Amino acid sequence: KIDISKQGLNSIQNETVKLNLMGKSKTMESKDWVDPQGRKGKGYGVYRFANKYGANVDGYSPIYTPDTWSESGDSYKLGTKGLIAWAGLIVVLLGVGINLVISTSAL
């Protein structure tokens, strides 16, 4: 019912984090998998009815989908000149603010 590829989780660099966000783990479906305490697995995986319902709750309602992120915003259009102007403005504003705070107080 749920297509994992259409959930917008394909733009994640870390493979382990990507598998975590879809509620999937290739290691756990193996019949010889043993968790830290030492209990064998029954082959269910993360979710027993993963095939019946498509995916898990993690793969149903994700809260971090880089695919839906805006194409812009990963690069600043104003470039280096904008950053230089911002640096000048923030230095000037910090100086003005500290001067106003000192002047209006009782020294």
């Binding site: 709750v57 149903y60 309602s61 809260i63």
Partner: protein
């Protein structure tokens, strides 16, 4: 087939076919609880007046001695005894035993042992039925609260007379004297406990209303939906997705719980932590670590005092402090 007497007894005690589970913790639980119940009923109905303050001023608490249900109580042990063990066989006679406040100590000890065994038996049946053993951990919060009000506070105050009476008006008196002496309302742990109970009521109503609002139609209008649910059925009887959609449009999408397991864990965790913290606050205040004292904190330029709601609360505390025991004090400081 069991043959030995002990093997048969163990099989019967640890049986899951009994109407009420006995277990090995129930072996301790049943007699102590029955003893405390019997003594409580008999003392609540027909017990003589008890000298609670040790100043030869008996206080009546029995129905047969002119009391109703709201007024009746079981008066704590005498102040003269203190923290000393006062079993029934340490008295010259039952008349002397009833005059000093023995039944309170008896009931308190048996009740403490019984509630500890009750929590143990909860774990035991969880293990025998194949469940996960944390309903007993949930019960630890009321167990700790009862222990704090019945054991730890007398332990830190040096007498069982400062313990909570086994009555209604006695409970109110305990609360008022506790406020007058420790300023419990200003304690952050009491604030956390109040938040715990208020949030528990909020979330109980919220969950009940959300589940009742998403019932799938399986009946007609001349019968209740409870008849629409069938015991032991396999399919879910309400729409979790519909309830989540309603709540996420009520506040916003990422505030509701899409996971039923996570939602029920949150429901379990909130009040339990709240009650844990309020019991810890009572136990801490037993050793005289009171709440915030913002008295005469706001001071103007010339040094005079500007009052505050904290100062009004202090005036009320002073009012209920000079009267909590009229004749039991000979010296100006209540150091106990």
């Amino acid at each position: 087939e069991s043959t030995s007497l002990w093997a048969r007894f163990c099989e019967w005690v640890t049986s899951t076919e009994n109407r009420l589970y006995i277990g090995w913790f129930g072996v301790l639980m049943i007699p102590t609880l029955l003893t405390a119940t019997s003594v409580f009923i008999i003392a609540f109905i027909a017990a003589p007046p008890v000298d609670i303050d040790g100043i030869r001023e008996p206080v009546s608490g029995s129905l047969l001695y002119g009391n109703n249900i709201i007024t009746g109580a079981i008066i704590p042990t005498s102040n003269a005894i203190g923290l000393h063990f006062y079993p029934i066989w340490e008295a010259a006679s039952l008349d002397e035993w009833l005059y000093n406040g023995g039944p309170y100590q008896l009931i308190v000890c048996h009740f403490f042992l019984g509630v500890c065994s009750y929590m143990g038996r909860e774990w035991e049946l969880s293990f025998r039925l194949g469940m996960r053993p944390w309903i007993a951990v949930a019960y630890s919060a009321p167990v700790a609260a009862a222990t704090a009000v019945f054991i730890i506070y007398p332990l830190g105050q040096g007498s069982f007379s400062d313990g909570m009476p086994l009555g209604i008006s006695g409970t109110f008196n305990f609360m008022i004297v506790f406020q007058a002496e420790h300023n419990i309302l200003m304690h952050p742990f009491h604030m956390l406990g109040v938040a715990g109970v208020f949030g528990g009521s909020l979330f109980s109503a919220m969950h009940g209303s959300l589940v009742t609002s998403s019932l799938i139609r399986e009946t007609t209008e001349n019968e209740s939906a409870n008849e629409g649910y069938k015991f032991g059925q396999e399919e879910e009887t309400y729409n979790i997705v519909a309830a989540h959609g309603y709540f996420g449009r009520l506040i916003f999408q990422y505030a509701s719980f899409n996971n039923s397991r996570s939602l029920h864990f949150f429901l379990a965790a909130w009040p339990v932590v709240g009650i844990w913290f309020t019991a810890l606050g009572i136990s801490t205040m037993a050793f005289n670590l009171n709440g915030f004292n913002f008295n005469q904190s706001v001071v103007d330029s010339q040094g005079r005092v500007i009052n505050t709601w904290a100062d009004i609360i202090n005036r009320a505390n002073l009012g209920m402090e000079v009267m909590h025991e009229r004749n039991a004090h000979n010296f100006p400081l209540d150091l106990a």
